[PDB]
């Protein structure tokens, strides 16, 4: 089926909390022992969420290569993602190896540092420009260059520089400030906007290494941008922008990460929000 139509032959009813369901059962299941790995318990954020052998991000030190990471590959929409956690007080460094291993331009931030009265990740970047940070046994040192606070979102100009070789590189941060505590938003579109400015950014081209996308877990807020992003960017390119199928591509996202898009709202929010860039990719 217009998906627009089957927002409403769902809605209607009310299977919202049951297609999700297909979603779950129908999902893929491999391997993840790396992850399960006694040694690799204190690099994971929680222990039903981990990824993919075939299809996680391997870090250059040989001593242990393990990060809760994976790599999702769309081929018809020649777009990759990152998509890993938030991190941990002793992955921070771990975090960077990473984005400067794979050649990434943007790092895309989902969540607050505390939300409903927890810390859901470390704070990785640095506050003030003249406070720069340092990781421990990790030869990387992060300035904060600029910040541009807006209502909704704020982006930032980051410098990465490898203290060995003396190279530097610009990393730039997006991070939407602006998810609900509970729920998802009513509108979406404020999120819309923010994709629009990364994908402005350049940051999801070729041209660079994937984007880097988290939330706390890596797999709810950061689900539903990939998904979106993917689905839209097929309405350019088909002949007949109302062929896409968002179960068909979610459940070919989920090939590559576990359990992306975590509840039935958050599904209904992903539908919501291609319908709705649906109708400006046809300006
Ligand atoms: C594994 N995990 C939840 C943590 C590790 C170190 N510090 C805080 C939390």
Redesign the pocket.
């Given at each position: 089926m217009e998906m627009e139509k089957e927002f409403e032959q769902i809605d209607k009813s009310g299977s919202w909390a049951a297609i999700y369901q297909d979603i779950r059962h129908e999902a893929s299941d491999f391997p993840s022992r790396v992850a399960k790995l006694p040694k690799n318990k204190?690099?994971?954020?929680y222990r039903d969420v981990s990824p993919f052998d075939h299809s996680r991000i391997k870090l250059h030190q040989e001593d242990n290569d393990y990060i809760n990471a994976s790599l999702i590959k769309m081929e018809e929409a020649q777009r990759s993602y990152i998509l890993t956690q938030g991190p941990?007080?002793?992955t921070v460094g771990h975090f960077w190896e990473m984005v400067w291993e794979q050649k990434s331009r943007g790092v895309v931030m989902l969540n607050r540092v505390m939300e409903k009265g927890s810390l859901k990740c470390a704070q990785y970047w640095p506050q003030k420009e003249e406070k720069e940070m340092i990781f421990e046994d990790t030869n990387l040192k992060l300035t904060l260059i600029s910040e541009d606070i807006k209502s909704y979102y704020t982006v930032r100009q980051l410098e990465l520089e490898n203290l060995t070789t003396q190279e530097t590189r610009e990393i730039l941060h997006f991070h939407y400030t602006t998810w609900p505590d509970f729920g998802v938003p009513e509108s979406p579109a404020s999120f819309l906007n923010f994709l629009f400015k990364v994908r402005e950014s350049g940051s999801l081209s070729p041209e660079h290494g994937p984007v880097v996308v988290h939330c706390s877990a890596g797999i709810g807020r950061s689900g539903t941008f990939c998904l979106a992003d993917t689905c839209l960017l097929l309405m350019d390119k088909r002949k007949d922008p109302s062929s896409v199928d968002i179960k068909k591509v979610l459940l070919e996202m989920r090939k590559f990460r576990m359990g992306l898009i975590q509840t039935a709202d958050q599904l209904r929010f992903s539908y919501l929000a291609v319908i709705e860039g649906a109708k400006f990719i046809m300006g």
């Open positions: 204190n690099r994971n954020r941990l007080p002793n």
